[PDB]
Amino acid sequence: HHHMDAAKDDLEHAKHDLEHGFYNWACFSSQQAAEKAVKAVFQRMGAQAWGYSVPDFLGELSSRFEIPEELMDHALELDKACDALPSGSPRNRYSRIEAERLVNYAEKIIRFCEDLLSRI
Template sequence: MNRAPGWLQQAESDLEIARITAQAGRHEWACFAAQQAAEKAVKALHLHLGQEAWGHLVTRLLTELPITVPSMLVEKARSLDTLYAPTRFSDAFPAGAPDEHTAPCRAGRRSPMLVRSLRSSVLRWPGRAEVLQALAAWTQRLELPGLAAVGAFSSYARGEAGVGSDLDVLVIVEERALPFERRMAQLPLDELPVLAEALVYTREEWERLGERSSGLAETLRRETVWVRGGVD
């Protein structure tokens, strides 16, 4: 019995739930449903190709397919995988519930677009150096009181970014009146050349990050490429 059509049908249903919950403002469930839709769609493809797959990580499910998968899809899967637990469990964030942190801009993100070179009519995706340079210029225009440092982490910092990759930005400020979940929305991230998300910490929160999440703190300190200022 071929169960692939059933899995694909459920994936389409989950995707519709993602759209409905996003429109209702329940962005944490919209993000989770989107992750589930991708997971079930890839499992349907596994079954269609004559093999069974287990687990929830879309990235791993894609890489275990017996066919070549575009790197752009794998990169997008990494973004979806980050939504599997944090959108449902409160302890994935410094404080508060998932629905307080899952902003509309994350649940309903615009599609990534290629850019046109100034010296060519060919559409292309900006490279690592170009993106980091744009980020550095962006920080000079950024009107943010008490701005201490700005850097990039994840794929652009590691030099692993490809077509469709998001830019992960780390911002450190001396003090911040807004609650953690509202800080990213205050940044003009749409001025950057690629889709971007940001973590905004006060200096005190940054220094104490290891107490709450030692793994995240270690990763950020190891990976971050500072383009303005810098903190230990």
Template sequence: MGRIVLVCYEYWRWMRQAEHTLQSIRADLDIGSYSWACFKAQQAAEFATRALLRALGRPAFGHNLVALFNELAGLCPTTGGELRFCVGYLDKMCLTPRYPDALTEGVPYERYTEEEAAKA
């Protein structure tokens, strides 16, 4: 088995951003901005996944959370199960919470609920 070299600086840069993004979700929940809370949950998961990939010296580009997670799961075979389900749910929160034309009618801030934000 090959030796794994961790790039800690990149890990911490991305993980700090993930943590900050998670903290900002609380304010969105308090004011009822559920669409932004959903989007930020996706972003926090993306940042954390990128942190792990970059720590392992892997490129981490794009916004497809499922693809990023699959790359990580390929490196860490025990990754999966319930986490894979969560990643699939969060991946759907990248575009629709932000863009009115991603919906057939209405605007994102009117369509997302507290329950969806809590789940995200």
């Protein structure tokens, strides 16, 4: 599963960016990791995957497998682009939490796809 290996590498990339405070980049890598993980399911099934977004691919996948609502919810958060809070701790705290959340979401999607691939 080339797409799965690449998903896991993107996740590790995200986690590295997170550790170093690069919250924007962690978000970006997380989106890519989730995308690649879902494509790995399409590749195993021999089916064409249309679209760019994680919501696109999970929606298509829903015709064949049950996709938990919370994963679609996470996907929609990951799909969003990677100010009224003050500079310093308020902004950095918000960004750090947001980036951790998105990394966790990508990881969740990866592990769901792993669970699916283990069974098909």
